[PDB]
Amino acid sequence: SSFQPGSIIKIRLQDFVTYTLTEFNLSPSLNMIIGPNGSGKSTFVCAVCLGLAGKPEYIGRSKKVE
Amino acid sequence: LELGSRLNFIVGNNGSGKSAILTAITIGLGAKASETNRGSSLKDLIREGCYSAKIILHLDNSKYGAYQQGIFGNEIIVERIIKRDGPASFSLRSENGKEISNKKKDIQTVVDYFSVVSNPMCFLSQDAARSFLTASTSQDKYSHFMKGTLLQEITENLLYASAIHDSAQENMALHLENLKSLKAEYEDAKK
Amino acid sequence: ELRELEHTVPQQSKDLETIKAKLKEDHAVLEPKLDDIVSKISARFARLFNNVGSAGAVRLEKPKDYAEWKIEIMVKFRDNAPLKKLDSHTQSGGERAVSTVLYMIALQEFTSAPFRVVDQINQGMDSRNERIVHKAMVENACAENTSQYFLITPKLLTGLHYHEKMRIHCVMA
Amino acid sequence: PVTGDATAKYLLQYILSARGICHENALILALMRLETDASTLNTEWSIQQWVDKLNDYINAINVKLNLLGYKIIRINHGIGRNAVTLKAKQNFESFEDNTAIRAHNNDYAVLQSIVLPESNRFFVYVNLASTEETKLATRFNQNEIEFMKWAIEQFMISGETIVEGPALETSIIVKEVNRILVAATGDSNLAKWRKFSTFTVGSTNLFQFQELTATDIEDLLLRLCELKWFYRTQEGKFGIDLRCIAELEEYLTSMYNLNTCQNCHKLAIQGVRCGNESCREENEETGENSLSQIWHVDCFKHYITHVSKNCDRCGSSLITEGVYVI
Amino acid sequence: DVDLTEDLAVAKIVKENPVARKMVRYILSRGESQNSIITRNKLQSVIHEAAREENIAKPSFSKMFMDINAILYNVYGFELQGLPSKNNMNAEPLGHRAQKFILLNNVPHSKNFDDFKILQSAHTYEELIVLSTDRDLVYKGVLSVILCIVFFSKNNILHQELIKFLETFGIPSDGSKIAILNITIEDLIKSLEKREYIVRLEEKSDTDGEVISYRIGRRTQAELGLESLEKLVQEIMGLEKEQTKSLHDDIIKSIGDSYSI
Amino acid sequence: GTCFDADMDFRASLKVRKFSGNLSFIKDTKSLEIYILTTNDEKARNVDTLSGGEKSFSQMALLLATWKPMRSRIIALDQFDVFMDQVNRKIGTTLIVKKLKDIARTQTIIITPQDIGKIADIDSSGVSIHRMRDP
Amino acid sequence: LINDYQVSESVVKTLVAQLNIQLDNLCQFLSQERVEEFARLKSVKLLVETIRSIDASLLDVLDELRELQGNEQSLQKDLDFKKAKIVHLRQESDKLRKS
Amino acid sequence: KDGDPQLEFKVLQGYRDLESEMHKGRAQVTRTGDIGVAMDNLNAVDSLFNKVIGIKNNGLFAHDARAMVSISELAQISVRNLKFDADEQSAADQQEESDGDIDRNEFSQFNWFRIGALYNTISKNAPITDHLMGPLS
Ligand SMILES: [Zn+2]
């Protein structure tokens, strides 16, 4: 591809935990994402992992996807 | 620190080194470099920037199971001055401060009178506790338990003595062959 | 019994030599492959170590049997005393964490993995080691074939030398 | 003589176990060692007389040495006879304690009884030549030299740049500075300057060379330390060894315009220079950065004991306008 | 004046030869870094190189070698010896005719001195640790131990027997980097081979493959003085003059055909 | 007797907290499976089927069960709160105040971050909490 | 839903494997606790699993290597016993001939 | 005899002193090869264990087994030394041992100190030296 392999694009979450809707126009260059939790940044990582055939138990915050 | 008849339930918040408090208490019984978390120099065993690591332990024997109450005093003052250089000084005082002993061998005698670190179940490190409570599956649970029961070490020395018995049998064989040769020459010289 | 033994002996020796030849070929395969593996991994990670301005190496250990082989780390910053092995005994956890950071960096260097994610590992780390992690991300941006990089941090510090190929983010939560 | 010739042989042999550099007093002890091996000892000599014949032998030696493009020089250790002899009698104490197990002879009793007169001199058989076999040291590969030369350059830079701050009393150099100051002036609370410099830093930069693995690095360093080319401070810093110095002394003197002592006019990398920058200013008649005048520690002691407490390049208040040199 | 005049004439021959100086320079460099023997071919090769650079016709090779030997005696009391070939070991000083060459230290003891060196090094080790000098010292020490092994082995001991005796003295045969030396004993062995201290014998028995024994290499053999060996052993056990000749003959037994005497 | 009493004490502690079961102490495999039948569970399933806090409490109860027959009159424990639960810590303090209150022989060096020794019910006779001056 | 086509998780796992991505593997994805576990993982085992994250063909190669080592030990002890047996049988047969 | 702390600890103490005395006979046997030490230590440990009969603390069994191993080696070595009146095998250890002053099975300090010293004192190889001028270029 023109970009590096597996380059992510804007990700749309909907009805997730608290986020009824949201969309992140991600960056192919770099991501120095700095900031603590409070809206579920770890839950955001769990969302990314589970939505891509990844077991949430890699971290272990919440298990059941539903 | 305030203690007495009651156990050492150290309520030590963050910044007091609760695990470090446990390690200092353990070093009260002579821990080594890999069981002290302080390295070759003993400066960090003392307060960082201090020299006189004073371990003062008034041990009163006015209850069940008294050790030398008329000799070591009713109380016993364990005084371990762990310093930056040289071996740590020791003083096993009586109730009135009379230093009955100056070494931890009498502490060992008192403990054996009381059984009050060698066993993993006895003393567990942060890594050991983490392995026991989080990094222990049925096999690892088994290993932790057997070590704590010393059953692992038990069987260790068991088969170690067994191995030396095999060595002993080899000695039996070789030395018996030598005896056979000597007795063969003996009998031939007889005849 | 001797007939049985003397019949089996040539066969047993033949099987032993078949083994030996297989082992020799396995050495000739892995040992150069592992050589490149460890050599270039260590080269990248230690050059990054120096970019930090810190002492750290990763040595491969190959005893007589492959089952005995392993990888160890041996680092140093305190100039007062010479370098020794880096393990989980007495060192600061932040040093080991940065070592793992360089570990995954070299993994990207070698494995097909075309992008990087760091999931808030920097919890409990001090100012210095987290700044080191940030500069590791900078060097990730300083490398060629700019891939996708992600690092999750709770806070940010001052004195962050920046460049153009990079893209600083901010996770909001 | 053949006796003396073989003597000098054995001397050089020790020198090889001394790997090329030997103490004045250690040489003396070897002398007594040899005279016990020779049983020719005549008790009636002051240590000076032994020194005399020692040096006579030395001259015969260096006669031939000069025939050989190699040579022994006697110098005085820059840390000075007193500090040298302090550390050396810390081990002469360990020595007489170890020899009491062997002090079954009156010779050994005399040896332990002869308190060593304080002396910082060493003798060094050193190359005088640069040709094929010379570069054919065969010690190790080329990178090791180039990088070590680089580190030497780093130490040169370190020495040149003066660092200001409290003196490291951890350095015994400062201790003996103050001791000499009290001995000469009697001012027990004389104010110390905060101006000082040294080469020993840069171990951190040993680990800043990037062209080889850290292991190999350390190991080569261990060789050198064993080979006593550089030296380890207990703070972790490294300087370059006195004998190693004499070698590079002359080469670097050529390469960097290195000013020598002022009294003995020998280059010393430790001692006392003038903290007045005007003494360390460039001599404008030359256009060269003129490092501040500095005597050997003994040279400084004799000067102040007999000449002045003011600089000559600048005249400054060397009581206050000095610089400790490490 | 014998030394003075002799060294004077030496200096004269030096006026005819600075080449010898450079030669010993390379000699001692190669050794010190390597502890090395040198081949006749290498000698004459560097000699011809020098003759070209000196731009002087090549004089007698025997001349040259004798001259430098005398040089480093009057300066060093040493003898340059060449070795008889390895082919002469399994099938007048030759000098110019000898093939492999090294330097030998030609003085006797000075007992008190060596012991005092013992004393200094005792301070050393007691202070040392719970190195290259000492590193090689251990290397040589294991060497000497093994030498004694082969001597009780009558100049013949197999590989594995040696391995067991190494384990006998707590030597980790696991294949780890050697304590202090950070290498494998195998590499030590290969050194003694290249340093000609040992002989490795490999024979293809059709039942057990290649069986390997070992014998004493001529570096040690030329090194190994008889009286040196004997008084060495006396000093091993702190012995008096009583068992002198008795253990002397016991050592003769331990030798047997150990040397191509 | 140690395995027997360890299983018995494990069951007793679980009943005090609520539970029962067996220990598959396979020496040959050197694996200590802990098949505990719990009210929170269905059958004599392994403790791995329990919750993380439940598994931590089960491990703690098994460890105290191990302590029970051993000839040790001294035990220590530190750095466990980080990978456990405060409910488990409180239940352990209750177990100490109900067992170590009469165990005047074993010296328990147990280290906790919070001042749970005097906040919770762990002080009693025999051996129990004593004042540690918080920083 | 691959391109908004509903499927199970197996196809997405195949995609993750084919994308050079492993959200599970620590070499590509781990946490701080996993980082410290890595800091305590067996150097042998940890190195092996990293290699697996790179190559597993050589992993099985090594496994067969150790297996062949075990077979070698077994067969070697067998050869030793056979040698001792042969020698003893020869001596005993000599005795039988004498008898 | 089932659980007296005094008996157990005195067994410990006697066994530790026994270990010290057996180390003494270790060097005794290395120089000479006496079997009486082995047999008597065996008898001592067995008698103490007989007192430990009924007492059931693991550490005592472990240390007793240590004693067992040591005594068995003692006896085997002494028998080997008894069979005939090897010597180098005795000597090299003694060489190592006599280079073992210590305060009174890893590799000692003066072990290698003595050995290397000996070789130097005796090597017919002359010592060597090196330098840097010319590699200094
Ligand atoms: Zn001036």
Residue numbers in the entry:
A (entry chain A): 35 to 100
B (entry chain B): 98 to 213, 215 to 289
C (entry chain A): 896 to 1068
D (entry chain D): 11 to 336
E (entry chain E): 9 to 99, 114 to 152, 173 to 303
F (entry chain B): 970 to 1104
G (entry chain A): 151 to 249
H (entry chain F): 40 to 124, 184 to 202, 213 to 245
Please quote the authors directly.
The eukaryotic Structural Maintenance of Chromosomes (SMC) family includes the protein complexes cohesin, condensin and Smc5/6.
Our study serves to confirm the overall architecture of the complex, plus provide details of how and where the Nse1/Nse3/Nse4 KITE-kleisin subcomplex interacts with the Smc5/Smc6/Nse2 core. Additional experiments also reveal the presence of a crucial interface formed between the head domain of Smc5 and Nse1, which utilises the equivalent of the ‘W-loop’ or ‘F-loop’ found in Smc4 and Smc1 respectively.
